[PDB]
Amino acid sequence: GSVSMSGGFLRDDHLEFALHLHRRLAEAVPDGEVIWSPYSVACALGVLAAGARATTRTELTTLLGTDPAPLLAALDRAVTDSPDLASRTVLWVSADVPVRSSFRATMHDRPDSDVRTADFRTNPEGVRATVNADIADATRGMIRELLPQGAVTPDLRAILTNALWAKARWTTPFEAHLTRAGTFRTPRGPKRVPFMHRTKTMPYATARGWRMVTLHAHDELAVDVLLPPGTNAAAVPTAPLLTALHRRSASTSVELALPRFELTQPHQLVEVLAEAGVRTLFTASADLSGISTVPLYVDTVIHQARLRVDERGARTIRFSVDRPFHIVVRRRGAILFLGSIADPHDPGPA
């Protein structure tokens, strides 16, 4: 087909999947502050879909909007040859449950992904320590205790744990000495926080009262920053809005004020996936014949993304990100990070 001359954009079914789930995640918390990786979750669900059959598989492919095989092929590229990324996925399975070699292969074909044995029954806290240490090391120490105390119990047989960490290394860094305090309207009222400042030509778009800029980073990473209408400051973006904002983007001299921030959140995804239509997977009715030769269902899926946004990472329009905003970190057709930020936490100058 014809090519993109403006950097490319997201796969349609991935965009729809990501923004539908994001709405559910945002609604689940009071001030709608959420961060996660559509890349990581789509990949995890796609792999489980490859090992699923019947209604269990159908629910997954309906949520993703596609069969797993072509999706996983496309998703792998989103994180390869990216030095600033740290990804890890493990399906931890009881030693008593045999795993098919073909399923191990499907998992292995994904970057930094594995299927591991865990003796849940004999030492739950030992398993927790092993799981957490696995994610910790693979994320370069950035997600250190994925599973909290009491999350692992002797009755578990299959948990999928995933994490993603990244720092965005801008093509043009913010000058650190120009970072200065400014007012941000948090849920506890206005607060003085460090804003990074740059005036540079960049993609800028408006759509239905929304406003967006795109920050270019090294290694094919793009970061869209979105401000909702001032009259609806708690609004959450939709797929059609993102499509419109991308289409309507034009190179514009922009005076950008952007808080320095970092956010991470552990998510157990059972509840939100149930709301989304993926239910059978987490019940005894699950058909995971492609994963194991004995009956099996996934007890839970636990995911944690951590993103740091700072100065380096490692006819002028005013665009001041001084109230709740949204961030879309994308690469090669996938959203690596999707965030809604209500109360920016400063990681500091170091």
* In the chain, where the domains are located: 10-37+170-260+316-344, 38-169+261-315
Burial class (CB in 10 A: 0-12, 13-18, 19+), 102: exposed
Question: What CATH code would you report for 38-169+261-315?
Answer: 3.30.497.10
- What technique was this entry resolved by? X-ray
CA distance 146 to 132: 6
Name the residue with tokens 């795109």: 214
Phi/psi of residue 43, nearest 5 degrees: -60, -50
- Residues written for the chain: 350
Please give the order of strands across the beta sheet that includes 85-94: 113-118, 85-94, 158-167, 300-309, 261-268
Resolution in Å, one decimal, please.
1.8
Phi/psi of residue 290, nearest 5 degrees: -75, -20
Per the CB < 8 A criterion, the answer to whether 163 and 139 are in contact is yes
Maximum pairwise Cα distance, the chain: 68
Q: How far is CA 74 from CA 77, 108, 140, in A?
A: 6, 15, 25
Pairing status of strand 34-36 against strand 334-341:
antiparallel
Helices 54-64 and 12-27, axial angle in degrees (round to 10): 90
Per the CB < 8 A criterion, the answer to whether 77 and 111 are in contact is no
Token pair of 126 as six digits: 């030992």
Per the CB < 8 A criterion, the answer to whether 37 and 331 are in contact is no
Question: Please, how many CA atoms are within 13 Å of residue 212, restricted to the half-sphere of its CB?
Answer: 27
DSSP string, 37-69: -HHHHHHHHHHHHHH--HHHHHHHHHHHTS-HH
The one-letter amino acid code at 42 reads A
Nearest to 217 by CA among 258, 167, 254, 259: 167
CA distance 120 to 96: 10
Burial class (CB in 10 A: 0-12, 13-18, 19+), 155: exposed
Q: Please give the DSSP secondary-structure letter assigned to residue 130.
A: H
CA distance 80 to 219: 10
Domain 10-37+170-260+316-344 in CATH 2.30.39.10? The answer is yes
Paired residues of 300 in beta bridges: 159
Token pair of 62 as six digits: 């309906």
Cβ-proximal residues to 29 (8 Å cutoff; 6+ apart), any chain: none
Per the CB < 8 A criterion, the answer to whether 168 and 261 are in contact is no
Name the residue with tokens 């030492």: 123
Q: Please give the DSSP secondary-structure letter assigned to residue 107.
A: H
